[PDB]
């Protein structure tokens, strides 16, 4: 049973690391590619075996016309922002939701807060405070999940790996639960 997952969200919110941590189980500290090669992970959920196809994307404005080719035949979407970037969260309803709904009507979204491990980081809090901001809070995340009609809201750190296996367990559960049936 094949399902397709595409991961979207702003540049530098941790999309690629998340994806790499999921396939390698090691956070990359040496080099982080801009976009990780799509690949096929064999996961099992709710007494069921799943061929899961994972696509990383380029979030930049510059690739707004390129990136939407990843969408056809997508079964679940991971829509990220970073817990250390309330801007990345403002763009969820301003950019990612209008896009994902446009190209992927009827397709479940899991809203994902990345970099949990920065919530209580000292240096981080200072930087945000220097522009009158704080880290995003779980209520702010869940609220957004409701506002955009997300199947779920999960939080994670790919640095510490807390939440990673649960994010993709949810995405996969979303894909099984769930315009135009198939493009080939």
């Amino acid at each position: 049973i094949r399902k397709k997952l595409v991961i979207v969200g702003d540049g530098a919110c941790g999309k690629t690391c998340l994806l790499i941590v999921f396939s390698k189980d090691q956070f990359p500290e040496v080099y982080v590619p801009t976009v990780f090669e799509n690949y096929v992970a064999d996961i099992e959920v709710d007494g069921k075996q799943v061929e899961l196809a994972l696509w990383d994307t380029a979030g930049q404005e510059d690739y707004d016309r390129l990136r939407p080719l990843s969408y056809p035949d997508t079964d679940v979407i991971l829509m990220c922002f970073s817990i250390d970037s309330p801007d990345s969260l403002e763009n969820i309803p301003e950019k990612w939701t209008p896009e994902v709904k446009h190209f992927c009507p009827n397709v479940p979204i899991i809203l994902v807060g990345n970099k949990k491990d920065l919530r209580n980081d000292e240096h981080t809090r200072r930087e945000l405070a220097k522009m009158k901001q704080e880290p995003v809070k779980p209520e702010e995340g869940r609220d957004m999940a409701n506002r955009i009609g997300a199947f779920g809201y999960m939080e994670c750190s790919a640095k510490t790996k807390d939440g990673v296996r649960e994010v993709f367990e949810m995405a996969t559960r979303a894909a099984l639960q769930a315009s135009g049936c198939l493009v080939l």
């Binding site: 590619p33 801009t34 976009v35 990780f36 090669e37 799509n38 380029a58 404005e61 510059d62 690739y63 707004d64 016309r65 390129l66 939407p68 080719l69 990843s70 969408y71 056809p72 939701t97 209008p98 896009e99 709904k101 446009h102 190209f103 992927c104 009507p105 315009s179 135009g180 049936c181 198939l182 493009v183 080939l184």
Partner: protein, 167 residues
């Protein structure tokens, strides 16, 4: 709410971050008018022969003929098409079904964004059920249309469905 981005050629796309290996592979993975609609097929398990329209010319031969279909049968519509030079953004498929001059259905699907490639693309709709009963046999006129984010008009062809008691 969604707002289409600035038009960008495939070369403008490749010029950008052209020294990034990882983005080079990304673009490689994902990559006469630009879009050509080639064929309309009816995918139907119970049909005794193949059900196809060639749309590469002679668009003036419906309404002279049609697809015959046994009342009550399940089928999908499969549209084939070709993208020749540049990206099509967010291509949409729209269908209006007519019966005796009355519009009985309207349906439209986000087919998606597609880059140019050699082999044609095949878009399959969800399963539909042929009509049935004494009052629903004979001809339905169908207006098929494509459009996209860079185009506020359509590619249009018009085909017929003729529903019978038997095949």
């Amino acid at each position: 709410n969604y707002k289409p981005p600035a038009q960008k050629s495939i070369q403008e796309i490749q010029e950008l971050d052209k020294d990034d290996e990882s983005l080079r592979k990304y673009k490689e993975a994902l990559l006469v008018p630009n879009v050509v609609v080639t064929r309309l097929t009816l995918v139907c398990s119970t049909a005794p022969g193949p059900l196809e329209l060639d749309l590469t010319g002679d668009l003036e031969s419906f309404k002279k003929q049609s697809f015959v279909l046994k009342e009550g049968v399940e089928y999908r519509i499969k549209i084939s098409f070709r993208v020749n030079r540049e990206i099509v953004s967010g291509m949409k498929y729209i269908q209006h079904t007519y019966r005796k001059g009355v519009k009985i259905d309207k349906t439209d699907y986000m087919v998606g964004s597609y880059g140019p490639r050699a082999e044609e693309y095949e878009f399959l709709t969800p399963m539909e059920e042929a009509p049935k009963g004494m009052l629903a046999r004979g001809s339905y006129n169908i207006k098929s249309r494509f459009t996209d984010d860079d185009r506020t008009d359509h590619l249009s062809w018009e085909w017929n469905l003729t529903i019978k008691k038997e095949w």
